[PDB]
Paper text:
Proliferating cell nuclear antigen (PCNA) is a fundamental protein involved in maintaining genome integrity, with roles in both DNA replication and repair. PCNA is a trimeric, ring-shaped molecule with pseudo-hexagonal symmetry that can accommodate double-stranded DNA through a central pore. Each processivity factor monomer possesses one binding pocket for a PIP-box bearing protein.
To investigate the halophilic adaptation of such a key protein we have crystallised and solved the structure of Haloferax volcanii PCNA (HvPCNA) to a resolution of 2.0 Å. The crystal structure of HvPCNA was solved to 2.0 Å resolution and contains one trimer in the asymmetric unit. The overall architecture is very similar to other known PCNA structures, as expected. 274 water molecules and nine sodium ions are modelled in the asymmetric unit. HvPCNA also has a relatively small interface and so forms just five main chain hydrogen bonds, with further side chain interactions involving Asp172 OD2 with Tyr106 OH and Ala109 N. The net charge, calculated assuming histidines to be neutral, of HvPCNA is -31, considerably higher than the remaining PCNA structures (-13 to -20). Examination of the inner ring reveals that HvPCNA possesses only two basic residues (per monomer), Lys143 and Lys205, that extend into the channel and are likely to contribute significantly to the postulated water-mediated interactions with the phosphate backbone of DNA passing through the pore. The principle cation binding site is located around a carboxylate cluster (Asp146, Asp150 and Asp198), towards the inner edge of the ring and appears to contain two Na+ ions coordinated by the carboxylate groups, water molecules and main chain carbonyls.
Author numbering:
A (entry chain C): 2 to 80, 83 to 243
B (entry chain B): 2 to 90, 96 to 123, 127 to 243
C (entry chain A): 2 to 28, 32 to 59, 65 to 80, 85 to 89, 97 to 108, 112 to 115, 120 to 243
Write the structure that this text describes.
Amino acid sequence: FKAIVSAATLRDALDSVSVLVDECKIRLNEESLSIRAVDPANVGMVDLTLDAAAFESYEAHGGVIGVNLSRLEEVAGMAGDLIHLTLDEETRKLNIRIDGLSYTLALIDPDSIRQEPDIPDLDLAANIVLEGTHLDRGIKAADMVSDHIRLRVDGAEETFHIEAEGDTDDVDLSLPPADLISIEAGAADSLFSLDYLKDMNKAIPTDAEVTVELGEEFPVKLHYQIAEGMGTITYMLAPR
Amino acid sequence: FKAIVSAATLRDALDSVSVLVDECKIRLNEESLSIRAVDPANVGMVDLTLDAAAFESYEAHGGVIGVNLSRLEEVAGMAGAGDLIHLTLKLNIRIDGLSYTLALIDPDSIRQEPDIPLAANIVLEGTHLDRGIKAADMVSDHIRLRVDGAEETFHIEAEGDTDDVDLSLPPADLISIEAGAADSLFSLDYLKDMNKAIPTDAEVTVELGEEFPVKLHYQIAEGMGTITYMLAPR
Amino acid sequence: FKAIVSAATLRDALDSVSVLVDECKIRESLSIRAVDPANVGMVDLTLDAAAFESYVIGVNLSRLEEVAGMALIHLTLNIRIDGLSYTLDPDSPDIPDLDLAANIVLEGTHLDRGIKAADMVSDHIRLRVDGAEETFHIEAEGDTDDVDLSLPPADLISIEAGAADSLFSLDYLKDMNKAIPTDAEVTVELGEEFPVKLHYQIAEGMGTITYMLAPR
Ligand code: NA
Ligand code: NA
Ligand code: NA
Ligand code: NA
Ligand code: NA
Ligand code: NA
Ligand code: NA
Ligand code: NA
Ligand code: NA
């Protein structure tokens, strides 16, 4: 495995996974690098695919490696620098080089890291595409009154609602179609742990458009792209 | 009660009160919105007047409501300073597509509102009160405000154990002064926190005496609100 | 005494010493020399008259800093910065001359960078020269991971590449580095299990600071 990737690219990519886990398996496939992981509680799941085209250079033959993702993140943080990634299959180390700086990261046996989850294909009733700013905002407001967040469609009005109910205060971010990028307004109303949804949203880069798949008392999925399109990230969040 | 007001106004308005108390009565008046409070130690008092002309729209009709200030503040915090906040009487607060329902409080459940009841008068640029307060704090938790009449000169000063400090503001560094005898000692932390609430460029009027409370006055909302603080002497 | 000094020049001055001790002795020029409670780190600051617009006491150093942050500072302890008047016993080290085998001149950024990377893996930092390749390394070794900022000639200001490889407390090197201005050129003298010295200038080359740090 050997690759050369832009600093912002890799940091956006590892940021998504690091929201849920501190160690992960990276699949080093011939035409993309991917990571999929579930958290310990089985409440959140992430699926990253970063196409070969996102790299300035990418060469991989199908291996899998196990990494301390918090260390590897800290390292990628030292970098518009390029980050050079080279695996030593012999010593089981990943060399990361950024200019003259060379960091040798000892791999972890993948068999020792949480089994990769299957993110189930769902046919949830509603689909909402919107600017990430709205999800930031609604999550900030909700956090004021509760640690639970409700995502709800008004199917008639084609309006997406991010809301929460506290002991006496309530909040409601109402997003009719003029504040959306698109909506299929099927029946949808689910409640989630706010903190998970907020950490997730925090990894989404600030100008990204987010796709939300939402039903009634089911998990929510969120999809977005990074690397000008050549990477895609999907989160899935179980309802509470 | 129905009012629409700019974010930066309401924030400036609530900040002055928040400095001193966590809840307050807001008197909803026909021509103006007003709050007055005193802290629990009964040492600092604030009096805010928010006139109609500060609200884009403002209709009120004599009521009064009790409010948890921290929360209403955090809510207003959510707007673009440019954004309008819609207030409608629980109090409903809407900002762009965001609506918040804030449960009032029994006004009778709150500390009685004070009324704010001097030889020198000093108008200066808030920036000198910042500096003066910051310097003084390095050396002490008591801060002395003193006029040197002859010299028509305002001093913000403090005496260490080891060290002292003195910010001397003669006429050139003042907006104007009526330099009556005045020399009075205060809790620096009360003055500092009050100061913290004053906007960066506001002009501040200080009334000062000899062993007497100090008052500070300044304007918000480009002129349509007025805030008075009074702080008891030591 | 009486002086009139640039705020930014006097802050960079006092910073280099403040980093090592909370209190100190001030003495053609101004100077301070102190070594830290553990006798491990030392500083020798020298400010030339020309660093001063106009130009032995024993100062409380963290307070002088706090006052200088209110800012030309007039020094007459009595301090004045515009309208601001602040009123604030020396009996209350030998930096050896070494001919350390190596001498490296480099941009400050590099040393920042090497220390930040080393810190992710250890609280010990290694400074090493590769004589052959005239390449300065800043490196660390962890429980399982390693880092090496390798700085060949192309990435240096100068190098006299003697044999040298010494190990140090990263926290003290990191504190020292804190006070060094962001675009300073730093000269390092280095040998084989010996103290390191760092030299840099302030006040436009009007001021010179030396640090020395004992090895581990
Ligand atoms: Na669907
Ligand atoms: Na919360
Ligand atoms: Na919480
Ligand atoms: Na008067
Ligand atoms: Na103080
Ligand atoms: Na204090
Ligand atoms: Na030498
Ligand atoms: Na460390
Ligand atoms: Na450490």
